[PDB]
Amino acid sequence: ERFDAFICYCPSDIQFVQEMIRQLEQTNYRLKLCVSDRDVLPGTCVWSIASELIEKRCRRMVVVVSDDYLQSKECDFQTKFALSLSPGAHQKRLIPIKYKAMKKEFPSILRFITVCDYTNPCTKSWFWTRLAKALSLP
């Protein structure tokens, strides 16, 4: 019902959502992720239910950024709705994640928020710690 993080992703990025399920929910972190393909019930508006999940039921929103993420549109609506709720990132509500090598530009609208980067081999040791800590605070 109530969650810790809404996960915004496209059909290609659902597998990093599986790694995320494993690492954040099936470990000592005990995080509750509102994966769309699992916790969003059919019959609900793909816009209104995401709006009232991000606004009133999840405390944060996680964006699994990629090239196939930019090719999507539902993810872009949800991302712009996240930024619209805490603009200027004053509430730490929006966590963009880079987990894969990209040959396209990072979303220019998310340029000023801190990207959790899984691609750097000398900083991956704090990836899951930082993500679980960011999802663990009010």
Side-chain angles (χ1 to χ4, degrees):
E1 190 80 345
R2 214 270 204 273
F3 291 91
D4 297 358
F6 181 88
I7 305 189
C8 177
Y9 64 92
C10 67
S12 301
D13 296 330
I14 188 178
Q15 298 196 326
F16 196 75
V17 185
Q18 297 284 9
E19 296 287 350
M20 198 176 306
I21 289 164
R22 281 187 281 271
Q23 293 293 338
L24 303 187
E25 314 194 309
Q26 305 171 5
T27 59
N28 198 262
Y29 297 130
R30 323 294 209 201
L31 294 171
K32 307 168 187 171
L33 306 171
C34 182
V35 193
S36 66
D37 296 290
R38 183 187 69 181
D39 293 292
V40 177
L41 279 58
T44 61
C45 179
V46 292
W47 321 124
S48 195
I49 209 64
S51 303
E52 206 184 336
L53 272 170
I54 294 158
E55 186 192 23
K56 301 173 181 180
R57 289 178 177 81
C58 304
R59 291 192 295 175
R60 312 280 190 262
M61 204 191 81
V62 167
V63 180
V64 190
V65 184
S66 66
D67 291 342
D68 288 352
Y69 162 89
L70 297 170
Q71 300 295 109
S72 80
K73 277 105 175 185
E74 69 287 356
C75 300
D76 297 62
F77 169 85
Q78 298 169 0
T79 299
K80 292 174 178 177
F81 186 85
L83 277 174
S84 308
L85 193 47
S86 69
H90 183 82
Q91 292 181 295
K92 318 171 301 181
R93 286 184 56 98
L94 183 55
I95 298 98
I97 286 182
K98 187 197 174 186
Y99 79 103
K100 177 181 177 168
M102 294 184 65
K103 54 199 308 177
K104 300 173 183 58
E105 187 65 282
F106 184 88
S108 184
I109 198 185
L110 307 176
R111 174 183 285 145
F112 70 96
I113 52 188
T114 324
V115 188
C116 191
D117 195 355
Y118 204 82
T119 68
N120 193 218
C122 38
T123 63
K124 192 179 57 66
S125 306
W126 305 293
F127 183 96
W128 298 112
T129 315
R130 287 173 67 206
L131 185 62
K133 182 166 54 175
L135 300 184
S136 303
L137 304 172

PDB file of all heavy atoms in Angstrom, residues 85-109:
ATOM      1  N   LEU A  85       6.857  17.797  -8.388  1.00  0.00           N
ATOM      2  CA  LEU A  85       6.378  17.759  -7.013  1.00  0.00           C
ATOM      3  C   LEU A  85       7.371  18.374  -6.036  1.00  0.00           C
ATOM      4  O   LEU A  85       6.965  19.093  -5.116  1.00  0.00           O
ATOM      5  CB  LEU A  85       6.060  16.321  -6.608  1.00  0.00           C
ATOM      6  CG  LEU A  85       5.270  16.200  -5.309  1.00  0.00           C
ATOM      7  CD1 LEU A  85       4.096  17.168  -5.307  1.00  0.00           C
ATOM      8  CD2 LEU A  85       4.786  14.778  -5.136  1.00  0.00           C
ATOM      9  N   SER A  86       8.668  18.107  -6.213  1.00  0.00           N
ATOM     10  CA  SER A  86       9.735  18.777  -5.471  1.00  0.00           C
ATOM     11  C   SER A  86      10.690  19.399  -6.483  1.00  0.00           C
ATOM     12  O   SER A  86      11.787  18.870  -6.722  1.00  0.00           O
ATOM     13  CB  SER A  86      10.473  17.814  -4.543  1.00  0.00           C
ATOM     14  OG  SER A  86      11.237  16.881  -5.287  1.00  0.00           O
ATOM     15  N   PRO A  87      10.307  20.510  -7.109  1.00  0.00           N
ATOM     16  CA  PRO A  87      11.208  21.156  -8.067  1.00  0.00           C
ATOM     17  C   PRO A  87      12.424  21.740  -7.371  1.00  0.00           C
ATOM     18  O   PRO A  87      12.365  22.177  -6.218  1.00  0.00           O
ATOM     19  CB  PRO A  87      10.339  22.252  -8.697  1.00  0.00           C
ATOM     20  CG  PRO A  87       9.257  22.498  -7.712  1.00  0.00           C
ATOM     21  CD  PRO A  87       9.012  21.206  -7.002  1.00  0.00           C
ATOM     22  N   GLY A  88      13.544  21.737  -8.089  1.00  0.00           N
ATOM     23  CA  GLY A  88      14.805  22.127  -7.503  1.00  0.00           C
ATOM     24  C   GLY A  88      15.422  21.095  -6.588  1.00  0.00           C
ATOM     25  O   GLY A  88      16.457  21.381  -5.972  1.00  0.00           O
ATOM     26  N   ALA A  89      14.812  19.913  -6.468  1.00  0.00           N
ATOM     27  CA  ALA A  89      15.364  18.790  -5.708  1.00  0.00           C
ATOM     28  C   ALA A  89      15.576  19.134  -4.237  1.00  0.00           C
ATOM     29  O   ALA A  89      16.519  18.650  -3.606  1.00  0.00           O
ATOM     30  CB  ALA A  89      16.671  18.292  -6.327  1.00  0.00           C
ATOM     31  N   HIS A  90      14.696  19.961  -3.671  1.00  0.00           N
ATOM     32  CA  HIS A  90      14.860  20.369  -2.281  1.00  0.00           C
ATOM     33  C   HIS A  90      14.540  19.248  -1.300  1.00  0.00           C
ATOM     34  O   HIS A  90      15.013  19.289  -0.158  1.00  0.00           O
ATOM     35  CB  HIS A  90      13.982  21.583  -1.980  1.00  0.00           C
ATOM     36  CG  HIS A  90      14.150  22.116  -0.592  1.00  0.00           C
ATOM     37  ND1 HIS A  90      15.182  22.959  -0.239  1.00  0.00           N
ATOM     38  CD2 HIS A  90      13.428  21.911   0.536  1.00  0.00           C
ATOM     39  CE1 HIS A  90      15.083  23.259   1.044  1.00  0.00           C
ATOM     40  NE2 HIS A  90      14.027  22.636   1.537  1.00  0.00           N
ATOM     41  N   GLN A  91      13.762  18.248  -1.713  1.00  0.00           N
ATOM     42  CA  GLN A  91      13.308  17.194  -0.815  1.00  0.00           C
ATOM     43  C   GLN A  91      13.989  15.854  -1.069  1.00  0.00           C
ATOM     44  O   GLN A  91      13.608  14.855  -0.449  1.00  0.00           O
ATOM     45  CB  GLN A  91      11.790  17.036  -0.918  1.00  0.00           C
ATOM     46  CG  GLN A  91      11.009  18.220  -0.376  1.00  0.00           C
ATOM     47  CD  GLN A  91       9.509  18.018  -0.466  1.00  0.00           C
ATOM     48  OE1 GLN A  91       8.949  17.927  -1.558  1.00  0.00           O
ATOM     49  NE2 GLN A  91       8.850  17.941   0.686  1.00  0.00           N
ATOM     50  N   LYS A  92      14.986  15.807  -1.957  1.00  0.00           N
ATOM     51  CA  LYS A  92      15.717  14.577  -2.274  1.00  0.00           C
ATOM     52  C   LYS A  92      14.788  13.471  -2.775  1.00  0.00           C
ATOM     53  O   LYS A  92      15.043  12.286  -2.550  1.00  0.00           O
ATOM     54  CB  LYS A  92      16.519  14.075  -1.068  1.00  0.00           C
ATOM     55  CG  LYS A  92      17.239  15.152  -0.271  1.00  0.00           C
ATOM     56  CD  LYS A  92      17.817  14.577   1.021  1.00  0.00           C
ATOM     57  CE  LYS A  92      16.725  13.965   1.895  1.00  0.00           C
ATOM     58  NZ  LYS A  92      17.254  13.422   3.178  1.00  0.00           N
ATOM     59  N   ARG A  93      13.708  13.844  -3.466  1.00  0.00           N
ATOM     60  CA  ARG A  93      12.666  12.885  -3.818  1.00  0.00           C
ATOM     61  C   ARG A  93      12.977  12.069  -5.065  1.00  0.00           C
ATOM     62  O   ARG A  93      12.340  11.031  -5.276  1.00  0.00           O
ATOM     63  CB  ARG A  93      11.336  13.606  -4.035  1.00  0.00           C
ATOM     64  CG  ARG A  93      10.653  14.086  -2.775  1.00  0.00           C
ATOM     65  CD  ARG A  93       9.300  14.688  -3.116  1.00  0.00           C
ATOM     66  NE  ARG A  93       8.462  13.744  -3.847  1.00  0.00           N
ATOM     67  CZ  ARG A  93       7.523  12.992  -3.284  1.00  0.00           C
ATOM     68  NH1 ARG A  93       7.297  13.080  -1.980  1.00  0.00           N
ATOM     69  NH2 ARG A  93       6.807  12.157  -4.023  1.00  0.00           N
ATOM     70  N   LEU A  94      13.917  12.507  -5.897  1.00  0.00           N
ATOM     71  CA  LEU A  94      14.125  11.926  -7.221  1.00  0.00           C
ATOM     72  C   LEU A  94      15.555  11.415  -7.335  1.00  0.00           C
ATOM     73  O   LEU A  94      16.503  12.206  -7.316  1.00  0.00           O
ATOM     74  CB  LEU A  94      13.824  12.954  -8.310  1.00  0.00           C
ATOM     75  CG  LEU A  94      13.942  12.457  -9.748  1.00  0.00           C
ATOM     76  CD1 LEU A  94      13.071  11.239  -9.924  1.00  0.00           C
ATOM     77  CD2 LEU A  94      13.540  13.546 -10.721  1.00  0.00           C
ATOM     78  N   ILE A  95      15.707  10.103  -7.485  1.00  0.00           N
ATOM     79  CA  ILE A  95      17.020   9.465  -7.534  1.00  0.00           C
ATOM     80  C   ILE A  95      17.254   8.876  -8.921  1.00  0.00           C
ATOM     81  O   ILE A  95      16.765   7.776  -9.216  1.00  0.00           O
ATOM     82  CB  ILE A  95      17.151   8.378  -6.453  1.00  0.00           C
ATOM     83  CG1 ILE A  95      17.008   8.979  -5.051  1.00  0.00           C
ATOM     84  CG2 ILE A  95      18.473   7.637  -6.589  1.00  0.00           C
ATOM     85  CD1 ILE A  95      15.621   8.823  -4.456  1.00  0.00           C
ATOM     86  N   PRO A  96      17.980   9.559  -9.800  1.00  0.00           N
ATOM     87  CA  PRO A  96      18.310   8.966 -11.100  1.00  0.00           C
ATOM     88  C   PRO A  96      19.477   7.998 -10.981  1.00  0.00           C
ATOM     89  O   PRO A  96      20.468   8.266 -10.298  1.00  0.00           O
ATOM     90  CB  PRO A  96      18.683  10.182 -11.953  1.00  0.00           C
ATOM     91  CG  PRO A  96      19.248  11.143 -10.962  1.00  0.00           C
ATOM     92  CD  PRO A  96      18.463  10.944  -9.687  1.00  0.00           C
ATOM     93  N   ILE A  97      19.353   6.863 -11.662  1.00  0.00           N
ATOM     94  CA  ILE A  97      20.336   5.789 -11.594  1.00  0.00           C
ATOM     95  C   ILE A  97      20.866   5.515 -12.991  1.00  0.00           C
ATOM     96  O   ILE A  97      20.086   5.282 -13.922  1.00  0.00           O
ATOM     97  CB  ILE A  97      19.736   4.506 -10.992  1.00  0.00           C
ATOM     98  CG1 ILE A  97      19.542   4.656  -9.485  1.00  0.00           C
ATOM     99  CG2 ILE A  97      20.611   3.301 -11.310  1.00  0.00           C
ATOM    100  CD1 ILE A  97      18.990   3.412  -8.834  1.00  0.00           C
ATOM    101  N   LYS A  98      22.186   5.536 -13.134  1.00  0.00           N
ATOM    102  CA  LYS A  98      22.854   5.073 -14.342  1.00  0.00           C
ATOM    103  C   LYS A  98      23.515   3.738 -14.029  1.00  0.00           C
ATOM    104  O   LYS A  98      24.409   3.670 -13.179  1.00  0.00           O
ATOM    105  CB  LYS A  98      23.886   6.086 -14.839  1.00  0.00           C
ATOM    106  CG  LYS A  98      24.484   5.725 -16.193  1.00  0.00           C
ATOM    107  CD  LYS A  98      25.768   6.487 -16.470  1.00  0.00           C
ATOM    108  CE  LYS A  98      26.423   5.997 -17.754  1.00  0.00           C
ATOM    109  NZ  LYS A  98      27.752   6.629 -17.983  1.00  0.00           N
ATOM    110  N   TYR A  99      23.069   2.682 -14.706  1.00  0.00           N
ATOM    111  CA  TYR A  99      23.580   1.343 -14.468  1.00  0.00           C
ATOM    112  C   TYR A  99      24.257   0.724 -15.679  1.00  0.00           C
ATOM    113  O   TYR A  99      24.848  -0.354 -15.550  1.00  0.00           O
ATOM    114  CB  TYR A  99      22.446   0.414 -14.002  1.00  0.00           C
ATOM    115  CG  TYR A  99      21.551  -0.101 -15.114  1.00  0.00           C
ATOM    116  CD1 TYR A  99      21.686  -1.400 -15.595  1.00  0.00           C
ATOM    117  CD2 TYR A  99      20.570   0.706 -15.678  1.00  0.00           C
ATOM    118  CE1 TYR A  99      20.872  -1.879 -16.607  1.00  0.00           C
ATOM    119  CE2 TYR A  99      19.749   0.234 -16.693  1.00  0.00           C
ATOM    120  CZ  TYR A  99      19.906  -1.059 -17.152  1.00  0.00           C
ATOM    121  OH  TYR A  99      19.096  -1.532 -18.158  1.00  0.00           O
ATOM    122  N   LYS A 100      24.201   1.372 -16.837  1.00  0.00           N
ATOM    123  CA  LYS A 100      24.641   0.778 -18.087  1.00  0.00           C
ATOM    124  C   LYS A 100      25.369   1.831 -18.908  1.00  0.00           C
ATOM    125  O   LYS A 100      25.089   3.028 -18.795  1.00  0.00           O
ATOM    126  CB  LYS A 100      23.438   0.211 -18.857  1.00  0.00           C
ATOM    127  CG  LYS A 100      23.734  -0.379 -20.223  1.00  0.00           C
ATOM    128  CD  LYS A 100      22.449  -0.879 -20.868  1.00  0.00           C
ATOM    129  CE  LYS A 100      22.700  -1.415 -22.264  1.00  0.00           C
ATOM    130  NZ  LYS A 100      21.526  -2.168 -22.790  1.00  0.00           N
ATOM    131  N   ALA A 101      26.322   1.377 -19.719  1.00  0.00           N
ATOM    132  CA  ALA A 101      27.022   2.279 -20.623  1.00  0.00           C
ATOM    133  C   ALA A 101      26.042   2.888 -21.617  1.00  0.00           C
ATOM    134  O   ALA A 101      25.226   2.182 -22.216  1.00  0.00           O
ATOM    135  CB  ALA A 101      28.135   1.533 -21.360  1.00  0.00           C
ATOM    136  N   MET A 102      26.118   4.205 -21.781  1.00  0.00           N
ATOM    137  CA  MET A 102      25.237   4.936 -22.680  1.00  0.00           C
ATOM    138  C   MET A 102      26.045   5.587 -23.791  1.00  0.00           C
ATOM    139  O   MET A 102      27.175   6.037 -23.573  1.00  0.00           O
ATOM    140  CB  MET A 102      24.440   6.013 -21.938  1.00  0.00           C
ATOM    141  CG  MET A 102      23.442   5.479 -20.932  1.00  0.00           C
ATOM    142  SD  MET A 102      22.466   6.802 -20.194  1.00  0.00           S
ATOM    143  CE  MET A 102      21.564   7.396 -21.622  1.00  0.00           C
ATOM    144  N   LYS A 103      25.454   5.630 -24.983  1.00  0.00           N
ATOM    145  CA  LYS A 103      25.991   6.388 -26.105  1.00  0.00           C
ATOM    146  C   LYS A 103      25.026   7.494 -26.514  1.00  0.00           C
ATOM    147  O   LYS A 103      25.017   7.935 -27.664  1.00  0.00           O
ATOM    148  CB  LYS A 103      26.313   5.472 -27.285  1.00  0.00           C
ATOM    149  CG  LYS A 103      25.159   4.605 -27.754  1.00  0.00           C
ATOM    150  CD  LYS A 103      25.668   3.426 -28.574  1.00  0.00           C
ATOM    151  CE  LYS A 103      26.596   3.884 -29.690  1.00  0.00           C
ATOM    152  NZ  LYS A 103      27.159   2.738 -30.458  1.00  0.00           N
ATOM    153  N   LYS A 104      24.199   7.938 -25.570  1.00  0.00           N
ATOM    154  CA  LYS A 104      23.321   9.083 -25.748  1.00  0.00           C
ATOM    155  C   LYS A 104      23.462   9.998 -24.539  1.00  0.00           C
ATOM    156  O   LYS A 104      24.019   9.620 -23.504  1.00  0.00           O
ATOM    157  CB  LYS A 104      21.858   8.656 -25.937  1.00  0.00           C
ATOM    158  CG  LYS A 104      21.612   7.761 -27.145  1.00  0.00           C
ATOM    159  CD  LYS A 104      20.177   7.252 -27.172  1.00  0.00           C
ATOM    160  CE  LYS A 104      19.940   6.289 -28.329  1.00  0.00           C
ATOM    161  NZ  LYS A 104      20.846   5.107 -28.289  1.00  0.00           N
ATOM    162  N   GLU A 105      22.948  11.215 -24.679  1.00  0.00           N
ATOM    163  CA  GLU A 105      23.085  12.210 -23.626  1.00  0.00           C
ATOM    164  C   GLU A 105      22.201  11.862 -22.434  1.00  0.00           C
ATOM    165  O   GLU A 105      21.098  11.331 -22.588  1.00  0.00           O
ATOM    166  CB  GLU A 105      22.728  13.598 -24.162  1.00  0.00           C
ATOM    167  CG  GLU A 105      22.989  14.748 -23.195  1.00  0.00           C
ATOM    168  CD  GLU A 105      24.465  14.937 -22.883  1.00  0.00           C
ATOM    169  OE1 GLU A 105      25.012  14.167 -22.064  1.00  0.00           O
ATOM    170  OE2 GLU A 105      25.079  15.859 -23.461  1.00  0.00           O
ATOM    171  N   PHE A 106      22.704  12.153 -21.239  1.00  0.00           N
ATOM    172  CA  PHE A 106      21.899  12.024 -20.036  1.00  0.00           C
ATOM    173  C   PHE A 106      20.754  13.035 -20.078  1.00  0.00           C
ATOM    174  O   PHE A 106      20.927  14.138 -20.607  1.00  0.00           O
ATOM    175  CB  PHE A 106      22.769  12.249 -18.799  1.00  0.00           C
ATOM    176  CG  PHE A 106      22.049  12.046 -17.499  1.00  0.00           C
ATOM    177  CD1 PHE A 106      21.981  10.790 -16.915  1.00  0.00           C
ATOM    178  CD2 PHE A 106      21.443  13.113 -16.858  1.00  0.00           C
ATOM    179  CE1 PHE A 106      21.317  10.602 -15.719  1.00  0.00           C
ATOM    180  CE2 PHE A 106      20.778  12.932 -15.663  1.00  0.00           C
ATOM    181  CZ  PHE A 106      20.713  11.673 -15.093  1.00  0.00           C
ATOM    182  N   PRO A 107      19.561  12.680 -19.553  1.00  0.00           N
ATOM    183  CA  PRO A 107      18.421  13.611 -19.592  1.00  0.00           C
ATOM    184  C   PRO A 107      18.761  15.005 -19.087  1.00  0.00           C
ATOM    185  O   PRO A 107      19.112  15.183 -17.917  1.00  0.00           O
ATOM    186  CB  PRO A 107      17.386  12.927 -18.691  1.00  0.00           C
ATOM    187  CG  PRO A 107      17.682  11.478 -18.844  1.00  0.00           C
ATOM    188  CD  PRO A 107      19.177  11.364 -19.011  1.00  0.00           C
ATOM    189  N   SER A 108      18.661  15.999 -19.978  1.00  0.00           N
ATOM    190  CA  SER A 108      19.090  17.355 -19.644  1.00  0.00           C
ATOM    191  C   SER A 108      18.279  17.937 -18.497  1.00  0.00           C
ATOM    192  O   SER A 108      18.772  18.798 -17.759  1.00  0.00           O
ATOM    193  CB  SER A 108      18.985  18.252 -20.879  1.00  0.00           C
ATOM    194  OG  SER A 108      19.486  19.550 -20.614  1.00  0.00           O
ATOM    195  N   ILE A 109      17.041  17.477 -18.327  1.00  0.00           N
ATOM    196  CA  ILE A 109      16.191  17.978 -17.257  1.00  0.00           C
ATOM    197  C   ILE A 109      16.610  17.441 -15.892  1.00  0.00           C
ATOM    198  O   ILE A 109      16.278  18.046 -14.865  1.00  0.00           O
ATOM    199  CB  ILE A 109      14.731  17.622 -17.579  1.00  0.00           C
ATOM    200  CG1 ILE A 109      13.763  18.463 -16.755  1.00  0.00           C
ATOM    201  CG2 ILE A 109      14.481  16.132 -17.367  1.00  0.00           C
ATOM    202  CD1 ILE A 109      12.326  18.058 -16.967  1.00  0.00           C
TER     203      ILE A 109
END
